[PDB]
Amino acid sequence: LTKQMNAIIDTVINYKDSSGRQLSEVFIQLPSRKELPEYYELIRKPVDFKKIKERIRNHKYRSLGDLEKDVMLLCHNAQTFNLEGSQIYEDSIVLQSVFKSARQKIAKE
Amino acid sequence: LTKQMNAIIDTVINYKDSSGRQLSEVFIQLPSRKELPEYYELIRKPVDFKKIKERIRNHKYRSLGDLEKDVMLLCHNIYEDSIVLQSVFKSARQKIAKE
Amino acid sequence: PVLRSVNSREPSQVIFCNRSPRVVLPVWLNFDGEPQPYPTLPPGTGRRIHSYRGHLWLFRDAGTHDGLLVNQTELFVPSLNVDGQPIFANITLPVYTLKERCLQVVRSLVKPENYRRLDIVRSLYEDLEDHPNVQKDLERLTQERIAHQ
Amino acid sequence: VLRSVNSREPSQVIFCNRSPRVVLPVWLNFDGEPQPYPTLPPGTGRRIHSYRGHLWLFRDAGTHDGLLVNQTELFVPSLNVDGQPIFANITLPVYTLKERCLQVVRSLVKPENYRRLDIVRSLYEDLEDHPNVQKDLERLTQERIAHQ
Amino acid sequence: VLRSVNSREPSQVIFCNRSPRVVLPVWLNFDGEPQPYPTLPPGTGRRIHSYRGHLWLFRDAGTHDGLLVNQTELFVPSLNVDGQPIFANITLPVYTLKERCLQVVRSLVKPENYRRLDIVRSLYEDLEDHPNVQKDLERLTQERIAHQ
Amino acid sequence: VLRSVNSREPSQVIFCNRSPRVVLPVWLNFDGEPQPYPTLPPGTGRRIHSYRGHLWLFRDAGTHDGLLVNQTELFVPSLNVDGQPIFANITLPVYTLKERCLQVVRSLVKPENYRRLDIVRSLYEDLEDHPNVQKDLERLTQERIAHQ
Amino acid sequence: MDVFLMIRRHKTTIFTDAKESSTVFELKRIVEGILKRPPDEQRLYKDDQLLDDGKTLGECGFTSQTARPQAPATVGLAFRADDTFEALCIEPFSSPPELPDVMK
Amino acid sequence: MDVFLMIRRHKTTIFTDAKESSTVFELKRIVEGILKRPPDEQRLYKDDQLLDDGKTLGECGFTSQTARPQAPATVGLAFRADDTFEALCIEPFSSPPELPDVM
Amino acid sequence: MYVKLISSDGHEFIVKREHALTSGTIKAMLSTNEVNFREIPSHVLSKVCMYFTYKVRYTNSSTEIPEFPIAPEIALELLMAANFLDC
Amino acid sequence: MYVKLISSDGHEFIVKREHALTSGTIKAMLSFAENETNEVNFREIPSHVLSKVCMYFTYKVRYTNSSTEIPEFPIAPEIALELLMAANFLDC
Amino acid sequence: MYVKLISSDGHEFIVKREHALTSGTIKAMLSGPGQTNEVNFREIPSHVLSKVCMYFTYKVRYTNSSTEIPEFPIAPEIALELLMAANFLDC
Amino acid sequence: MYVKLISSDGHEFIVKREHALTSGTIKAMLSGPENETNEVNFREIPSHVLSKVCMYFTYKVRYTNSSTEIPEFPIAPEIALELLMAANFLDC
């Protein structure tokens, strides 16, 4: 399960779009509250892509549906805070679409 | 000499003006080059006072005239404080070194 | 240095709310106390703007450079945030003197080269030509602070 | 935890009601008990004498519906800088469609008739659960013990 | 399609107004909405503190007439090399004689009086079609879908 | 060092001479040897083909006096974004009154006659120290070993 | 400010926004994106009269005060039979029940 | 726009800037600040013509393009003695020595 | 993208996906661009969308928010629909 | 207690005393220093102007020190110049 | 090569062909089968056609040219008739 | 504040303090311990020179940190040598 969970989370991070740019670069590490106090006043449950790798080693996620529930939570957290049509908004729309195709290849093939 | 050098450098740092505000924090720690590339392109020999407290422990300054030479260098490297500090260091060395 | 921002290092979240009928030019006084133009607020708009505490601001009609008010006064200085609450800058028309208000309207209708064609006193002509100005007003505000001190 | 702090330092404030509703300013006292204050008609503003650290809260005087002040739920005036007044901008929140519907139904139907509406039993209970300063204060505490 | 890119990497820029006109710098936001910024008087230059990948556009603050920056329509600062500032040179384009005439007529006649000019009907429409940042942005999008 | 690195990626640039002087563009080659290029008359501006990462320097073609490009001493074209040309704005620096006086004296008196001027020998030595690309390049390296 | 609109050809109803400033053509393009029919096959009507591809939404009549998010302005849509661009057809929404005496 | 000025009376020369839009009166006030003599004891001349307190420097003839920092425009100054004003007198600056033979 | 909500009487409502997701029950159903509501009439589902438009636009708007109006005639059926949707 | 302002063409305007005092020129004219004068006569101010000058007094008195929002005091082009003249004379 | 443009009142304007070709409508009249050096404008007066040439001078000169371009001035008195002439020509 | 520079022939030049400080020599003479006194006397610098030295202060202060083009600081042949001397003495 840990080998499968790493294949899905690493594919979403390593994923580059059709101009060669990596999308996860901004999502890899959440900013500090001193930096951006608004994110932590609006976003209820802040989580990043390294806090998901942390919870894959600590075995907090019991199934591949619990790993998905918190990748949708940050991708939806990001979408809320940012402007619609923003660079970061539409990539959390793509990172949900690349996670839903990455889990569908590893978990059943 | 180290006890005297600490009394002079700590008096200049702890020194508050007549509104209660401490002048030294803007000299206690130098900024990073990433932050402000203009100071490290225009200023030749960047030194803060934490780098002066460092050189008081390492004993790089041989006299009280060598400690002064590099406090004048950073203060020469808030417009008035660059000077107020020079004026509070020149009265702090004059009280400790001869009384 | 009299009327200037202060290097606080402590960020203050602020909400610029333009309740004037005019396009508003937010003007940040820098640490030296030199006016710095910032992006304009359309009438009836509000924005959250990242700022620092002790920073001193000032608002004006982006077009005419006419004087505005923020929280029923001329200068706005954000307080340190309490528990993350954003401080609020409410920007409004002042009650202009009838004269100054008339000047505003005449100035807005007549090209400056035609002020000479109006059958008015020369002093009024000079007043029309005098256009309101951040710097002139800053000089006045300092003398009003040395008169309180 | 949620209470005013006896301060001795005055803080002049401007209560600006930019809601369509009559606004009930609610001052939390030192013990932290809600105290109703004089109402602000829609589209009005008043300068009020308050103190530093005093905690306020605003609501629809009629329905006791929740309002917002400076995009948040509680207002605490900072120390005045140079005598200039602090500003409390009171506005509607974006109510859930449900809560908003309840508001309208509640305003049209007498509480004894909620039982006559051909709706789900759960909705009857929701209709009967009128909004309330104290219930909301309890919630706000748990939301501050969850941030600790 | 046409928007600034959130970068967090500062890029010092020099806005140099070498047009005879008052220049309105227009920053495209991340959402890609034009944002008016403070005007540059003719023959002036300012250091601007923008960010990498931020997209800008310049125009006659009065007429909303199209200007050029570095002989093109959009300016996007590169990351600074060795602390050296980027330069945005803002100038008049060579307007068509027609468009230039429209500019002058539009500047002399109130829009409600365009109807009173003893001219061809097509020109009435041309005078009415005032230049516009949004119209031009829409055009620039189709010119970028045509180059891909 | 002042490398002028081979790119193979072209970078269109606009050399704009906004100095009152005839400008000598000086391209540092890959070995880092100054290469004189065609002079720009005062108030002229031309599109030139350079490559990304190529390092340039500008000077008074006559006196070899130091100029500035985008308020700095070196110009390195960034990679063009969307084909937009980069801009090199070449200007006078604010010379010290001394250096400026030297410039004028040097321009009026033949170098073999510097000795005949009823001035101090130190000033004569300063006159004799004509400005020089190579001396200045050496200084710029020690200013980069000082940022290390 | 923006303008909030409902385009309702026949049974269908599209909910979308646009700029106060923007063009009737840009709106046709958004419809193209959803219903997969180009701007030259659609004609857009405000009430009973067609709006030209060239006009600013402002000039057509749509402003903040008539096209609010909770009271979107209704733009009519006509789709093209190859022989003729079909006449404007809008399908009326379901009626609400008579106001119960309890709410009077 | 900025205008750069030398206000000169006798052997005194004041170097200062002022706006085209600023007024002859405002300039007299700056002089008051330095030479401690009010605007009603001062007369300001552009060349030989007296300047009215109410006119803008612009209207008097001073422009940014003829009052540059390194070529300041000269405003003449006269003070009042009792019931009469002194003549406008601007004592000239020292002459330079004949151009040395090399130049 | 966009999403299609279909009323009992069979009207089609095309609204942005993110606008629709404001409804927990829709969020659940789309977790597919279609959803059919056999018990929600058009005059109701039309207004439910208008709320999505409103909520999306005015959430996190500092200066002023306008009251989301509901006419008596629609109030009860909307309350029903509202609760079913979780909007 | 009210005050009577009389225009050139001889219209009478009865406005509150405090409203009128917003004009320095009027304050001067009102304030023989044993008791108060009700009338003041403006030889060179027509009615269509003095009427609007009062409307300003109404406006100024009402909206001075009012907290949330003040509206712009409108002046039609047709009246603008004569009002500016009157305004400067009155000191309002 | 120089082309001759002739105004209504009958002034002759000799301008370079390349300068003239800036007008799409003149390009048409010259590159067409015709029966050239001359073109006659029966409805364009001299004070207008003179300024139309001045534009050709301007356009040709300040195009394919980089750092600064100056405003092409048009006096109010001529503005309307020039706009007409301008439209009738390609620019 | 302002500062008074006095030439050999005895002309007085009143220039802003900050403008004068452009000269290290002047900075030294003023900042050297009322304190920072208004006047400084140059017995070896004539007016036609010290006048131009001020004009440079005006120029330097104004055009330092000007982002676009700066104009040439002109020096006539007749004055060039004496100015160079004065310039070196002043450190400006």
Ligand SMILES: Cc1ncsc1-c1ccc([C@H](C)NC(=O)[C@@H]2C[C@@H](O)CN2C(=O)[C@@H](c2cc(O[C@@H](C)CN3CC[C@@H](N4CCN5c6cc(-c7ccccc7O)nnc6NC[C@H]5C4)C3)no2)C(C)C)cc1
């Ligand atoms: C959309 C829209 N619409 C309408 S309005 C608007 C809008 C509004 C705002 C913004 C943006 C996001 N916000 C802003 O622009 C805000 C607003 C207003 O608040 C100013 N500000 C700014 O950004 C300034 C600003 C930044 C800063 O940060 C300091 C704390 C810190 N930095 C600066 C001062 C340096 N100091 C660094 C040590 N340094 C020295 C150190 C030493 C030294 C010597 C020896 C030993 C040790 C030492 O440290 N020596 N010398 C030094 N020199 C001075 C000092 C400088 C760091 N504060 O203000 C910016 C613009 C200036 C966007 C849209």
Ligand SMILES: Cc1ncsc1-c1ccc([C@H](C)NC(=O)[C@@H]2C[C@@H](O)CN2C(=O)[C@@H](c2cc(O[C@@H](C)CN3CC[C@@H](N4CCN5c6cc(-c7ccccc7O)nnc6NC[C@H]5C4)C3)no2)C(C)C)cc1
């Ligand atoms: C005088 C004069 N005359 C003529 S013009 C002019 C003038 C010139 C300048 C100004 C003023 C002073 N300057 C401006 O107006 C400039 C210019 C133009 O460029 C816009 N701008 C602005 O200031 C915008 C602006 C400011 C900003 O600053 C960020 C880069 C710094 N931020 C820290 C944090 C980072 N981001 C990091 C990911 N982060 C997010 C992360 C996540 C996330 C991450 C991990 C896991 C899950 C997650 O969800 N999600 N969302 C994120 N979004 C936020 C983002 C923040 C960037 N950038 O732009 C202002 C206006 C917006 C005035 C006049």
Ligand SMILES: Cc1ncsc1-c1ccc([C@H](C)NC(=O)[C@@H]2C[C@@H](O)CN2C(=O)[C@@H](c2cc(O[C@@H](C)CN3CC[C@@H](N4CCN5c6cc(-c7ccccc7O)nnc6NC[C@H]5C4)C3)no2)C(C)C)cc1
């Ligand atoms: C009008 C006016 N007014 C005022 S000024 C002015 C003006 C300005 C400019 C010009 C003229 C027209 N322009 C210039 O002078 C410009 C400007 C400045 O930038 C220098 N420059 C030049 O032209 C140099 C120049 C040209 C070049 O082009 C290469 C990038 C592209 N070349 C193909 C191939 C590549 N390299 C490929 C690996 N290759 C090697 C490979 C290997 C190797 C590889 C694998 C395994 C084993 C191997 O050994 N080994 N060695 C290699 N060496 C060559 C290298 C080539 C190069 N770059 O710079 C010219 C002058 C030198 C006119 C007026």
